Design an enzyme around this catalytic site. Structure first.
Site, PDB file in Angstrom:
ATOM      1  N   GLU A 178     -27.415 -25.008  -7.596  1.00 58.17           N
ATOM      2  CA  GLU A 178     -28.609 -24.314  -7.106  1.00 58.17           C
ATOM      3  C   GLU A 178     -29.132 -24.986  -5.842  1.00 58.17           C
ATOM      4  O   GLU A 178     -29.244 -26.212  -5.778  1.00 58.17           O
ATOM      5  CB  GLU A 178     -29.709 -24.237  -8.172  1.00 58.17           C
ATOM      6  CG  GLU A 178     -30.892 -23.350  -7.744  1.00 58.17           C
ATOM      7  CD  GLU A 178     -30.459 -21.954  -7.310  1.00 58.17           C
ATOM      8  OE1 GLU A 178     -30.435 -21.028  -8.151  1.00 58.17           O
ATOM      9  OE2 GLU A 178     -30.127 -21.790  -6.122  1.00 58.17           O
TER      10      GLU A 178
ATOM     11  N   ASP B 180     -29.647 -16.487  -8.286  1.00 54.71           N
ATOM     12  CA  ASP B 180     -30.748 -15.596  -7.923  1.00 54.71           C
ATOM     13  C   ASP B 180     -30.242 -14.187  -7.619  1.00 54.71           C
ATOM     14  O   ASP B 180     -30.948 -13.374  -7.020  1.00 54.71           O
ATOM     15  CB  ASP B 180     -31.484 -16.138  -6.694  1.00 54.71           C
ATOM     16  CG  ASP B 180     -30.555 -16.393  -5.517  1.00 54.71           C
ATOM     17  OD1 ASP B 180     -29.423 -15.861  -5.504  1.00 54.71           O
ATOM     18  OD2 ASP B 180     -30.965 -17.123  -4.592  1.00 54.71           O
TER      19      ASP B 180
END
Ligand SMILES: *[C@@H]1O[C@H](CO)[C@@H](O[C@@H]2O[C@H](CO)[C@@H](O)[C@H](O)[C@H]2NC(C)=O)[C@H](O)[C@H]1NC(C)=O
Length: 482
Positions: free
Chosen positions: A204, A280
């Site tokens: 991430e 995401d």
């Protein structure tokens, strides 16, 4: 034994096992995946031919005859119910209805495993699968291992072609909230040596090719047609190991402590599973998934070595992408519409717009050339083909925003992919249907007398299911330009 039997014996059992090509457990005989055809939107499942065997591709071909098919579900073979379904919108919206990502074609990645036909998951930009309520997957700083057999020649530099652990909210919740395999040549964050692609770990807000953010020389470009990407992560430790899925051993590209930046140690894994997209839901990447798993615990190198040995033994080989009449490189043709009421029209072009026009023996020499095409070896794939204009040599039919245009070949990988189409036995039985190599859910399709790369049903008006089969079937005839 299958890959998961090996991981179990290595004391790091699979908690998720996905594959459209084969059973990953010697005893698995359940459904590998689910199909949905465009003719009537009905579904069916594909199971191994035998326990622990290869998928029954013939069953798919039968169900998908004279129509188009999508892979709706990639079942979890472990029994944890972590099936992968159409990925939902999140930080980013997908291009499908209500922000969902696209489902993958069922025929974009044909292969044979030890001689037996099977189908992989060919994912074009916008395609994605996910499960945000997975069971057994590592969370927090818990250790896990994972691997995937991918196509090292099918990738791009957009975020993000991942397979692994991600956020259960489909949003970017910060560093440490992901741990997944990434394959592509994105250089926005980390990257390896050479031109790529590289196997990296998405933790991430960073794709890591090594201990440092950004460039790491230790991670080499790996472009094998079949790549085994093995990644694992535990308390302040992680690794990247890669190999040619068709031969040999895994090589360690990275093994050591977590990148020394805030948020990566300890990790904050959430346990969701993603395929083909970012945590995401970034959905600009492309790639092909054949098989893969996620485990509980940090796999030893020896266990992974045994898994790689098994993968090699499965003998992955590229399959046929073409069916129907087809072409020969150098051949010049004219393509005729078969849709009732438009049968005197041919695929031509007005400047850069590819369309259909009434062309016959009385047509001008110029129009005859605009309705004539030199068929050459596929620019992005040698099995398929590309269509060069006769009046405008050097320019080929290519899709852009799903519209078919006649543009000059710039020699780039992107152009090559946008300009490669694979012949398929016409859906209406009349001639051929030209399927996009890069977006296998799309075909040459005339709508309002204009050519598009359309899908059998979709968000674009030209994706209309009305007369789809007829609108994507063309008769191959002698070229007007002789
Ligand atoms: C990832 O790899 C591709 C393929 O090598 C790179 O694409 C080239 O793109 C540049 C920038 O548009 C053009 O000058 C070249 O002509 C392209 N080459 C080919 C062979 O297509 C892409 O730039 C790479 N991405 C990153 C971020 O490094």
């Amino acid at each position: 034994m299958g890959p998961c039997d090996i991981y179990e014996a290595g004391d790091t059992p699979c908690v998720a096992a996905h594959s459209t090509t084969r059973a990953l457990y010697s005893s698995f005989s359940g459904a590998l995946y689910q199909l949905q055809r465009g003719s009537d939107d009905t579904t069916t499942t594909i199971s191994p031919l035998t326990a622990g065997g290869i998928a029954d591709a013939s069953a798919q071909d039968t169900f998908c005859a004279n129509t188009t098919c999508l892979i709706t579900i990639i079942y979890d073979q472990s029994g944890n119910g972590n099936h992968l379904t159409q990925a939902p919108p999140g930080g980013f919206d997908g291009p499908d209805t209500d922000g969902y990502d696209n489902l993958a074609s069922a025929i974009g990645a044909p292969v044979t495993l030890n001689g037996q036909k099977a189908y992989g998951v060919f994912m074009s930009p916008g395609t994605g699968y996910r499960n945000n309520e997975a069971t057994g997957t590592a969370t927090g700083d818990e250790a896990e291992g994972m691997y995937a057999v991918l196509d090292g020649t099918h990738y791009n530099d957009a975020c993000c072609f991942d397979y692994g652990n991600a956020e259960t909210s489909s949003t970017d919740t910060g560093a440490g909230h992901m741990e997944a395999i990434y394959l592509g040549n994105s250089t926005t964050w980390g990257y390896g040596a050479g031109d790529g692609p590289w196997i990296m770990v998405d933790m991430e807000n960073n794709l890591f090719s090594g201990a440092d953010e950004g460039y790491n020389s230790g991670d080499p470009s790996i472009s094998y047609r079949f790549v085994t990407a093995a990644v694992k992560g535990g308390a302040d430790k992680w690794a990247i190991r890669g190999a040619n899925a068709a031969s040999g051993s895994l090589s360690t590209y990275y093994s050591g402590a977590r990148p020394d930046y805030s948020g990566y140690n300890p990790m904050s894994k959430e346990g969701a599973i993603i395929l083909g997209i970012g945590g995401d839901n970034s959905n600009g990447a492309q790639g092909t998934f054949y098989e893969g798993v996620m485990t509980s615990g940090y796999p030893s190198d020896d266990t992974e070595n045994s898994v790689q040995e098994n993968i090699v033994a499965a003998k992955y080989v590229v399959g046929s992408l073409v069916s129907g009449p087809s072409f020969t490189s150098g051949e010049v043709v004219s393509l005729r519409v078969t849709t009732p009421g438009y049968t005197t029209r041919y695929i031509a072009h007005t400047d850069t717009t590819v369309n259909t026009q009434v062309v016959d023996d009385d047509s001008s020499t110029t129009l005859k050339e605009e309705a004539s095409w030199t068929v050459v070896t596929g620019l992005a794939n040698s099995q398929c083909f590309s269509f060069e204009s006769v009046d405008t040599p050097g320019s080929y039919i290519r899709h852009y925003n799903f519209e078919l245009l006649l543009n000059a070949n710039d020699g780039t990988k992107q152009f090559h992919e946008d300009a490669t189409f694979c012949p398929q036995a016409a859906l209406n039985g009349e001639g051929t249907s030209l399927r996009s190599w890069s977006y296998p859910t799309r075909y040459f399709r005339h709508y309002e007398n204009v050519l598009y790369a359309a899908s059998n049903g979709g968000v674009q008006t030209f994706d209309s299911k009305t007369s789809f089969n007829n609108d994507v079937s063309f008769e191959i005839e002698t070229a007007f330009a002789s």
